[PDB]
Each structure stands twice: as C-alpha cells, then as structure tokens.
Write a protein that binds this ligand. Structure first.
Ligand SMILES: *[C@@H]1O[C@H](CO)[C@@H](O[C@@H]2O[C@H](CO)[C@@H](O)[C@H](O)[C@H]2NC(C)=O)[C@H](O)[C@H]1NC(C)=O
Ligand SMILES: *[C@@H]1O[C@H](CO)[C@@H](O[C@@H]2O[C@H](CO)[C@@H](O)[C@H](O)[C@H]2NC(C)=O)[C@H](O)[C@H]1NC(C)=O
Ligand SMILES: *[C@@H]1O[C@H](CO)[C@@H](O[C@@H]2O[C@H](CO)[C@@H](O)[C@H](O)[C@H]2NC(C)=O)[C@H](O)[C@H]1NC(C)=O
Ligand SMILES: *[C@@H]1O[C@H](CO)[C@@H](O[C@@H]2O[C@H](CO)[C@@H](O)[C@H](O)[C@H]2NC(C)=O)[C@H](O)[C@H]1NC(C)=O
Ligand SMILES: CC1(C)CC(NC(=O)CCCCC[C@@H]2SC[C@@H]3NC(=O)N[C@@H]32)CC(C)(C)N1O
Ligand SMILES: CC1(C)CC(NC(=O)CCCCC[C@@H]2SC[C@@H]3NC(=O)N[C@@H]32)CC(C)(C)N1O
Ligand SMILES: CC1(C)CC(NC(=O)CCCCC[C@@H]2SC[C@@H]3NC(=O)N[C@@H]32)CC(C)(C)N1O
Ligand SMILES: CC1(C)CC(NC(=O)CCCCC[C@@H]2SC[C@@H]3NC(=O)N[C@@H]32)CC(C)(C)N1O
Lengths: 121, 121, 121, 121
C-alpha cells in the first residue's frame, strides 16, 4: 500500500511524520527540515494537508502546508504516492516556498519552486 | 486589516470562502473554481491551510490545499495578504496543480504552475 | 497579427525589444527590467529565444533567455502570444529566475518562479 | 572544469548536445527527449541559450530554449553547472513547458514545471 501515514525522509534529509488520514482525506504531521536559509535554529514545524479521495486511487494525489515555526515563510507541497519497480513507496512532490515581502511591489521575487522525493524511514 | 477570513474572488472568477483562523493559524473553507479542464461539472471543494504566525505580521504568508471533489487532482496555493495603495486587501498567490498519473514514469508531466490574485467580494 | 517583433512592456514596467524572427523562429533582443533585487544599477541585457513554428500557429508558443549584464542570475521566459477580445496583442509568460549558489547543497533554494504579462508599447 | 559544451543526459534519459559557447555566452545545440506526451514520433530539436558571463564564475548560471520539432510547445531550461563531491560535472536545472492553448481563457493551464539533472555522457 502507498499510505501517507508514517515517517518519511527526502533527498535533502528532511524528516516528515504524517498522522492518520481521516475519511475526508485530511492529515496533520510535523516537518523537520535539514536545510534552512535562515540564521535561526531549525525547529519542528506542523504540517496540514489533504489527499484526494476521488475514485479511491491506490496512488492518490495530495497536498500539505508547512507552517515554519522558525521562519516567516510558508511552503506548500503537492505530489503523488508511487509504488516503484521494487515495491517501495515513493512520494514525488513539487513545492512552493513563499517568503514574506514588506511591499506588494516586491511580490514578484517572493516565490521559490523545487522538488522533493520522499522515501519511508 | 488583511485577514484571510471571509469571501474572496480571483482573476479567473473562482470563489473562495475562508473561515476563522485559529490561534495556531489553521483555517478551513470552500473553493468554487470558475475554470476546469475536466468534463465533470464543477463542485464546491474543501480547502485546508495555515497562515504563518511568526512575528504577528500584518501581512503574513499562508498556504492551503484544495481537495477537488470532482477531479482527481490537488492544487496547493501559497501567497501573502497585501493592503494595496488604496487600502483594499489583495491576496497574491502562486499555485501548483498536481494531476494523477498511473505510472511514476509519467510523473515529470504531472505538475502545473500558475498565479492567482484574490480580492474581497 | 501576434508577432514577437517590436517593443513590449510588462506589468512590472520592464521594457522589451525583440528583433526580427528568422525562418527558424530564432530572435534576439534587449531586456530592461524595472525591478531588481541586486544593489547594482540595472542595465540593458540581451535576450535570445525561439518561437515554435510547427503549424504556423497564429499564436505560437515561445521561449527566451535573459542574460543579465548586472547580475549573476539567468531568467528564462516562456509563454504565448494572444489577440485578446479587443484585438490587442498580449504575451502571457511564466518565468524562472536562477540565482548563483556557491554549493550544490544550496541548489534547492536557487530557483524563483513568476509570471509576466507583456503588452505592446 | 564545468563547461556546457559537450553531450549530456538527464534523469529521464533525454540526450543533449551543446556546441561551443561564444565570448558572449551564447550556445546552440540539439535536444533528444526520451519522454513525450504527444502521439508524434520524437525528433531531434534545436536548443538556443546563453550562460551568464558576469564574474567569470566557475559554475555560471545558464538558460536555453528547446523548440520542439514534433510538438507545438516550448520548454525553457535554467540551472547551474556544479562540480560534485567526486569531480563529476552536474547540471541542475528547472524547466517550464508551455503548451499551446487556443484561447487566452485557457492560459491558466498551459504551463508545466519540473526539474532535470544532467550528467556528462
Ligand atoms: C530524519 O530521520 C532520521 C531517522 O531517525 C534521522 O537520522 C538519525 O539522526 C540521528 C541524529 O543524531 C542519528 O543519531 C541517527 O544515527 C540517524 N539515523 C539514521 C538511520 O541516519 C535524521 O536525523 C532525521 N533528519 C533530520 C533533519 O532531523
Ligand atoms: C463568485 O462569487 C460571486 C459573488 O456572489 C458570484 O457572482 C454572482 O453569481 C451569481 C450566479 O448566478 C449571479 O446571479 C450574481 O449576479 C453574481 N454577482 C456578481 C456581483 O457578479 C460568482 O458567480 C462566484 N463565482 C463562481 C465561479 O461561482
Ligand atoms: C519602458 O518603455 C517606456 C516607453 O518608452 C518607458 O516609458 C518612458 O520612460 C521615459 C524615461 O524618462 C519617460 O521620459 C517617458 O515619459 C516614458 N513614457 C511613457 C509612455 O511612460 C519606460 O521607462 C520603459 N521602462 C524602463 C524600465 O525603462
Ligand atoms: C542518450 O545518449 C546515449 C548515449 O549514446 C544513448 O544510449 C545509447 O542508445 C543506443 C540506441 O540504440 C544504444 O544502442 C546504446 O547502447 C546506448 N548506449 C548507452 C551507453 O546506453 C541514448 O539512447 C540517448 N537517449 C536518447 C533518448 O536517444
Ligand atoms: C528567502 C530565503 C531564501 C528563504 C526563507 N527561509 C525559509 O523559508 C526556511 C524555512 C525552511 C524551508 C525548507 C524548504 S522547504 C522545501 C524544501 N524541501 C525541504 O526539505 N527544505 C526546503 C527566508 C530567508 C530570508 C531566510 N531566506 O533567505
Ligand atoms: C490535467 C488537467 C489539465 C487538469 C485536471 N483538472 C483539474 O484539476 C480541475 C480541478 C479544478 C482546478 C482549478 C485550478 S486551480 C488553480 C487555478 N486557480 C483557479 O481558480 N482554477 C485553477 C485534470 C484534467 C485531466 C481534466 N485536465 O486535463
Ligand atoms: C536572489 C535575488 C532575489 C535575485 C537576484 N537578482 C536578479 O536576478 C536581478 C536581475 C533582474 C531580474 C528581473 C526578473 S526577471 C522576471 C521578472 N520579470 C521582470 O521584468 N523582472 C523580474 C540576485 C539577488 C541576490 C540580488 N537577489 O537577491
Ligand atoms: C500538454 C502535453 C502534456 C505536453 C505537450 N507535449 C510536449 O511538449 C512534448 C515535447 C517534448 C517535451 C519534453 C519535456 S521537456 C522537460 C522535460 N525534460 C525532458 O527531458 N522531457 C521533458 C503536448 C501534449 C498535448 C502532447 N501533452 O499532452
């Protein structure tokens, strides 16, 4: 099975624990990033997301928001669960990192984009 | 004030109602998209997200996930609330749309990106 | 007609002059950005791109690279030319801004994404 | 050295040959994609780009446009050359794929985003 519940780790070394997914596809969890651009100490951050429940797909899409507890930014992840050739689950995700800008004129430079690959711990 | 709670509409005509934001910055709501690539009839979809609570910023960043009830995809929004020159609130967001792909080999083509500007209704 | 040749201006106030498009769809030009995150003075920068010519579409897709002459970054634009409801040409583009990072470990944070809308001057 | 000139292959199996980079940082080449969403047979496609020449960086940023000869879309790549721990050259790139849409109302769904990692052949 390819279930979001459990512990995950991505290619950067970030930790991710996801709790039970309810009948509506909602789940919470904690995110421990290995990499930060801030000068603050990294701290465990809550994550909230949902997984698509249409058709009850064996590899449903999902998204979640990480509310960083040491930064003023927000990252959103979206991706899908895959059972690779071997039979091990993989989460392929793309993310957007939103920085805080003091002016709406600086908004053009506030969004970063990137990918992450999560495997089970 | 620039508060996510209330009704919003974006440049595509999509509706968005966000409920109260709790002390942890979590909020739920419903999303009614005006535009769909599916052949299904559009339907109101739940959204879940959080807004950054670090520093009590008057224009905090936020992210939320839309779990489409008529599609098998997931969209994640991230952006910031702005009080423009006049004094009207604006949400500047970028989003990722994740489609469902049956194979991990098709994963490269599953993510769309775009922007939305939300104003109060 | 919706031809890339000529002068353009986007929602940020950036200037853009595109030269003739050759039979292979290649074109050069200059880009004058109104907004910069650097402390350097902005300077006119060359751009190089091509436009798709597969079906001689009235609104072909295109892409080009801006090689900033005052920054160490690179921006790539991709979009399409549209003849809007009125009859005025519009270029709808999305871009990626690549910053220079000293280490491959910092590569995750080096890419920005955003949109631009160009109208004729 | 980390020079764009030569042959490259990415994680999808796509081929890439880049010619000499001139004093202005311009280069051409051909791109052979392993993966296509079209029903057409894949064909070698020209690419045009430039690499940043500011500061004579040993790992300068670059961008290029692929003008697909079998599709009506355009892909733009932007990234940086890295000399990894061992001594291998790696191109870390993000790309935007622009599809052709008949109407400006469909423009919201026309852009895909993704990453590619290129190693020397
Ligand atoms: C992600 O989770 C893994 C699994 O626990 C963490 O790896 C362990 O980290 C501790 C920290 O001292 C080490 O003592 C263990 O030996 C590590 N185990 C393995 C198997 O590597 C990892 O630290 C977590 N990532 C982050 C950023 O906290
Ligand atoms: C977004 O919300 C607005 C505000 O209610 C909707 O606009 C109304 O739509 C109804 C539908 O028949 C019309 O009767 C009203 O005249 C509209 N009011 C205004 C001020 O335009 C709009 O339909 C919503 N968008 C979607 C996609 O449902
Ligand atoms: C983009 O092009 C426009 C058109 O020339 C520029 O607007 C002019 O800028 C000069 C600069 O002093 C003014 O004197 C003119 O009055 C402006 N004309 C209009 C119609 O606004 C604009 O400056 C260019 N953008 C950048 C960033 O250089
Ligand atoms: C990318 O380049 C490599 C290197 O030539 C190609 O790999 C060869 O493909 C031919 C095709 O029949 C095989 O006969 C060789 O055995 C392959 N060599 C290796 C080392 O794998 C590859 O085909 C190219 N990719 C694409 C999409 O054409
Ligand atoms: C603007 C920038 C570059 C980013 C901001 N910093 C942060 O957002 C740190 C919070 C942790 C982000 C972890 C991302 S999230 C996606 C990816 N996947 C993963 O595991 N880690 C990364 C603010 C400052 C100003 C410091 N800097 O400069
Ligand atoms: C693959 C593609 C193109 C997309 C998929 N369709 C959907 O995801 C429809 C669900 C509503 C999305 C609304 C987006 S969300 C961001 C933006 N902002 C806004 O208001 N609307 C848009 C699946 C199919 C196969 C049908 N097609 O083909
Ligand atoms: C990392 C960051 C934020 C960006 C880098 N700066 C630059 O890239 C300036 C070069 C001009 C870019 C213009 C973009 S391009 C797309 C968009 N459309 C438009 O017209 N303008 C904008 C480097 C530094 C470190 C200074 N900062 O910090
Ligand atoms: C809309 C969509 C999904 C895409 C369009 N197809 C193409 O653009 C095929 C041209 C080759 C693209 C190769 C990309 S480029 C970045 C990445 N890196 C790599 O090596 N390959 C991939 C049109 C149609 C309608 C067919 N489909 O549906």
């Amino acid at each position: 099975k390819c279930s979001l519940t459990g512990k995950w780790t991505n290619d950067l070394g970030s930790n991710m624990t996801i709790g039970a997914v309810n009948s509506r596809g909602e789940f919470t969890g904690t995110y421990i990033t290995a990499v930060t651009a801030t000068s603050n100490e990294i701290k465990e951050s809550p994550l909230h997301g949902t997984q698509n429940t249409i058709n009850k797909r064996t590899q449903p899409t999902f998204g979640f928001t990480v509310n960083w507890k040491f930064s003023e930014s927000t990252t959103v992840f979206t991706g899908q669960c895959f059972i690779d050739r071997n039979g091990k689950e993989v989460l392929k995700t793309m993310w957007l990192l939103r920085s805080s800008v003091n002016d709406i004129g600086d908004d053009w430079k506030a969004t970063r984009v990137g990918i992450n690959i999560f495997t089970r711990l």
